[PDB]
Amino acid sequence: LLPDLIAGAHQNADPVVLDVSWISLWFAFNRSFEPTHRNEMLEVAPLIESVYASELSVMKVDMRHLSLMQRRFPDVLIQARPSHFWKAVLNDSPEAVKAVMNLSHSHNFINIRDMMRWVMLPSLQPSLKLALEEEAWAAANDFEDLMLTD
């Protein structure tokens, strides 16, 4: 964070810059901080972190199998773009897990080549809904079992 401040401001996320006054330097030397009330979302934080890290994993298995459809069935998909199965996963994901990513996705633009890098990364959080989703896609590999053929 410090060598990417001195050298050049591009290749990493810039720190958030706040604006203070001149005289509030003096009123900070004479006000200590005594945290009386601790935050009441502390003991609910290990569970909130585990739901959000698990729903990001189900979206990663959903993108890994949907991206292999244009090579398998090119006659149905002559005009399907990589923005199309992206739009199909987000229309099924929970609204909260989308609305955590959009605190910076509305602040920082990412294109198609950024998300398909995040999908391939080898890091999954195992839970009950993930470990069934990995077998549902494996059981539905042969699309004859989904009752459609050519």
């Binding site: 958030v16 810059v17 706040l18 604006d19 509305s106 602040h107």
Partner: protein, 50 residues
């Protein structure tokens, strides 16, 4: 004419602590009906280069 996203220039951390933009006095300006007629001349000068 689509305006950019409003959460680009200002980040909100808590209720009373937000980032402040550099050109804050200009983003909060509504154009007049003559200045908006000059914005259309610029995009009419961009779709026809020479």
């Amino acid at each position: 004419y689509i305006a950019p996203n409003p959460r680009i220039s200002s980040i909100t951390l808590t209720q009373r602590i937000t980032t402040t933009g550099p050109f804050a006095i200009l983003t909060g300006s509504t154009p007049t009906a003559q200045q908006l007629n000059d914005v259309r001349k610029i995009y009419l000068a961009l779709m026809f280069p020479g």
